[PDB]
Amino acid sequence: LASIFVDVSSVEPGVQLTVKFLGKPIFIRRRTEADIELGRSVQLGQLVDTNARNANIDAGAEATDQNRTLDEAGEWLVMWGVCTHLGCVPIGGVSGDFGGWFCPCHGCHYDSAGRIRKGPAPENLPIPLAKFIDETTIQLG
Numbered sequence: 194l195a196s197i198f199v200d201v202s203s204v205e206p207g208v209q210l211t212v213k214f215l216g217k218p219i220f221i222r223r224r225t226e227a228d229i230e231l232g233r234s235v236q237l238g239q240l241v242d243t244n245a246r247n248a249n250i251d252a253g254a255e256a257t258d259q260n261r262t263l264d265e266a267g268e269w270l271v272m273w274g275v276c277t278h279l280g281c282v283p284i285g286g287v288s289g290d291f292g293g294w295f296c297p298c299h300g301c302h303y304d305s306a307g308r309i310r311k312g313p314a315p316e317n318l319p320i321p322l323a324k325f326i327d328e329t330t331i332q333l334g
């Protein structure tokens with residue numbers, strides 16, 4: 194009975210909703226068209242971490258943009274808001290050098306798919322068990 198159910202019906206493009214789950218923040222960002230295009234423009238060979246870090250799919254999956262979102266359209270990016278270096282909360286709203294998140298504790302920069310691009314963090318922000326259960330609700334867990 195750990196699962197929770199998040200109403201995302203009012204989340205507009207370019208907005209991140211932050212919810213607490215298992216004691217930690219989950220970021221739910223409805224990505225803009227720029228975020229999506231930029232995420233899909235990155236080659237796997239450019240990435241620090243090529244693993245999708247995604248609980249919903251094979252653990253060996255590649256960190257393509259398509260393997261980082263809940264939907265095929267790429268609008269819904271759901272991830273743990275927990276820096277993979279030492280666990281600080283990354284700052285969003287298109288922050289840092291790669292149009293995503295910036296962790297100010299030791300300067301890690303994540304891209305528009307939450308992938309690590311610069312700084313001490315070793316891994317992409319992990320993606321929780323998450324799925325839409327209708328048009329307006331994401332089940333986490």
Ligand code: FES
Nearest residue numbers: 276278279296299
């Ligand atoms: S905790 Fe994020 S850069 Fe160190």
